[PDB]
Amino acid sequence: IQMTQSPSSLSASVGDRVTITCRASQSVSSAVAWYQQKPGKAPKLLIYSASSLYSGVPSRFSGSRSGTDFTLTISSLQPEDFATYYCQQGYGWLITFGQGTKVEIKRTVAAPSVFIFPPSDSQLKSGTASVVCLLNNFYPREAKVQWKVDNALQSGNSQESVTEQDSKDSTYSLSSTLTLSKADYEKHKVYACEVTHQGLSSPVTKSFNRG
């Protein structure tokens, strides 16, 4: 017995009606359960036996069965409902999980706050250099950060990482790190990160001069 979960992911505004469906490879009884998992935390039981709400779960979550299909529905999507939702078939001696549906919120466009951090002296004494560019509460998640050392566009020497969607304002934040040798860091001087994002008419550049 396997569970095919659709959709893979979805995007929806606050207040919308969202539905997630699991189909069973073989016929199953109403022994389906629905869990919600926020990033980096344990899953939380939302619904048991297909249609029954666990206590403490808001009424906006509901479960239904249509033969071999099982549906979890959020009547009015809230910003805190951003999560990966899983379906489980089983009775306690064997359970199988669905692949999961990642649900993120749609909201108005927000422009990133952009900050730049030069390497610490403590790190330069270690023989390495890390310059960090930070983008704060931007939506949508799509954005480009370009590193300019002495007004020369670099490539292949920087790695970025993005937080998961905020649960109150439904925004994202990004952090790009340009990693250079203390030697190559000290051979240049001007360090800038240029951010291109939808909420920015003209791209924004934040920079510093070494020393």
Added chain:
Amino acid sequence: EVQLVESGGGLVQPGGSLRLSCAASGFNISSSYIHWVRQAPGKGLEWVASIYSSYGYTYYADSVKGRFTISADTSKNTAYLQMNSLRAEDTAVYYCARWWASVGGAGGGLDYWGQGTLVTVSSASTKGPSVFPLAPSSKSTGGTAALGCLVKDYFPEPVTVSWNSGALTSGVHTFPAVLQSSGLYSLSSVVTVPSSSLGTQTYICNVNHKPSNTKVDKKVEPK
């Protein structure tokens, strides 16, 4: 309070063995089924095992059939998951959980879980991170100033970062670690504040890396 605490994970070399424990309180583990659920990094839930301790009935999945064994000591109210011949695909967060049942027999679900415990299967070595301050700048853009910490060159996951021992929480953004070209992990954790507040309250980031037994409380400051 029904509580479940996992323990016993960390770094283990391929082909090794590791015994995880799940200490339970608020109920007797003979009352219910105890489950082990694993999750690969950035992947879905996967059921590993289940036990009825009172009668000793075991239940496994085909992926961990011959190697993984699930035990239970009612004297200690503790479940155990011993894992042998560990492969790289066993790298995952392992949760223990209690199964609750609809009183009628409708079917039920896992109501209470543990925090999980990371099990990394890799020949690489444990290395402690280095914590560097990302100092605030002269800039004020919306009147905003960011400060933060950079935890660098560490193996394996995870590290935990908090600001002023959890008292500072608003405006905090801690980013997922990214595998460097070094084969080591490194991440950042920043916090946004008003520029005028810089001279008033102090900011300390607490970095914790248990595989290395590294606890650092670094004070971030202007200039």
